[PDB]
């Protein structure tokens, strides 16, 4: 068994110093997708250690090693919503911790919940979205469609199922009150990853940003955790152009595969999921303008040190404008043939 030897080494070899992963591992310029997948569970432990969660919460090391491997194992391999996505989202949470002084805004247990939620937030994703669950009358829709956020409820339920697996409950020494709090936070934070939920609370986020963050305001904590989660989830867009071009490839491969399935079901896919209609530069510009940029502008409004993130996302949006002309075929194709007509 592969997990078992992986577990044995994770537990008995000791936790690698976070600096040994990469020289700018803690920088907003680092691209966590550069880390070999085989190295990621140890990197999770290193980040947990560096944020002092292992010692502060007296987390059992065998239990933690098992949990981390179980969470990794709990992801399938669609083009985008896979473990490397969850790992990179988790890494960005770590970056927020290291760069933005979250301890001035949030409780320790909230920051811990955010990170664990990042690890778990897309568990068992099947490469299709909430709309598809309903349209395809999936088991997940049968369970959760009446509440909405079908996939996100599933990701949360999967997280709980991992904790309820013998040897994997990293929280089971917590007080009943603290345990209840952690699982409630995980619920809220994972459900916040539904972009429909983000769009619903957007005005509230703006309102919070304009009056000013009040650390004594419980609703402000809740709003901030949502914004931070969303910021982690979309953080691929805060990297260099090469990263975001690759992530566009992954997203649309996943989306177009769904679209093909919808067509086969006799359903007309959304344009962004229809490989015959989707014009990727215009779609990406739309995503950046209408969704990503305002999120990181809000983050900047709240945390001035986050300015560079917004600036990157803005820069990436302008890059799509710049390359768009390359999507139109001028001259002949390289084979000199018009066969594709
Ligand atoms: C890091 C990142 C993550 C994502 C998606 C992840 C899954 C959910 N997403 C959507 O439902 C969604 C919503 C609105 C959209 C509008 C225009 C184009 C695409 C859209 C996609 C976002 N995209 N999509 C494009 N670039 C991304 N970059
Ligand atoms: Mg998700
Ligand atoms: Zn995600």
UniProtKB/Swiss-Prot annotation:
Effect of residue 283 to S: Loss of 3',5'-cyclic-AMP phosphodiesterase activity. Decreased 3',5'-cyclic-GMP phosphodiesterase activity
Record-annotated active site: 81 (proton donor)
Residues binding Mg(2+): 122
Result after altering residue 244 to Y: Loss of 3',5'-cyclic-AMP phosphodiesterase activity. Loss of 3',5'-cyclic-GMP phosphodiesterase activity
Physiological role: cGMP-activated cyclic nucleotide phosphodiesterase with a dual-specificity for the second messengers cAMP and cGMP, which are key regulators of many important physiological processes. Has a higher efficiency with cGMP compared to cAMP. Plays a role in cell growth and migration.
Family: Belongs to the cyclic nucleotide phosphodiesterase family. PDE2 subfamily.
Name of this protein: cGMP-dependent 3',5'-cyclic phosphodiesterase
């Amino acid at each position: 068994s592969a997990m078992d030897d992986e577990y044995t080494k994770l537990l008995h070899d000791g936790i690698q110093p976070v600096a040994a992963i990469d020289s700018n591992f803690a920088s907003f310029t680092y691209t966590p997708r550069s880390l070999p997948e085989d190295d990621t569970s140890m990197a999770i432990l290193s980040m947990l250690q560096d944020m002092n969660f292992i010692n502060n919460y007296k987390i059992d090391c065998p239990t933690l090693a098992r949990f981390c491997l179980m969470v990794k194992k709990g992801y399938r391999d669609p083009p985008y919503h896979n473990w490397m996505h969850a790992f990179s989202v988790s890494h960005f949470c770590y970056l927020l911790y290291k760069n933005l002084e979250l301890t001035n805004y949030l409780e320790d247990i909230e920051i811990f919940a955010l990170f664990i939620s990042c690890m778990c937030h897309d568990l068992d994703h099947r490469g299709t979205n909430n709309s598809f669950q309903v349209a395809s009358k999936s088991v997940l829709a049968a369970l959760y469609s009446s509440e909405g956020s079908v996939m996100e409820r599933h990701h949360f339920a999967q997280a709980i199922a991992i904790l309820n697996t013998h040897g994997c409950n990293i929280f089971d020494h917590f007080s009943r009150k603290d345990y209840q709090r952690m699982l409630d936070l995980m619920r809220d934070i994972i459900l916040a990853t539904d972009l429909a939920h983000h769009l619903r609370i957007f005005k509230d986020l703006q309102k919070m940003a304009e009056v000013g963050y009040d650390r004594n305001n419980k609703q402000h904590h809740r709003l901030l955790l949502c914004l931070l989660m969303t910021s982690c989830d979309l953080s691929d867009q805060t990297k260099g152009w090469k990263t975001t071009r690759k992530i566009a490839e992954l997203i649309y491969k996943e989306f177009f595969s769904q679209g093909d399935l919808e067509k086969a079901m006799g359903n007309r896919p959304m344009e962004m999921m229809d490989r015959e209609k989707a014009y990727i530069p215009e779609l990406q510009i739309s995503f950046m303008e209408h969704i990503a940029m305002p999120i990181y502008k809000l983050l900047q409004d709240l945390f001035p040190k986050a300015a560079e993130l917004y600036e990157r996302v803005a820069s990436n949006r302008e890059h799509w404008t710049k390359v768009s002309h390359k999507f139109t075929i001028r001259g002949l194709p390289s084979n000199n043939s018009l066969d594709f007509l």
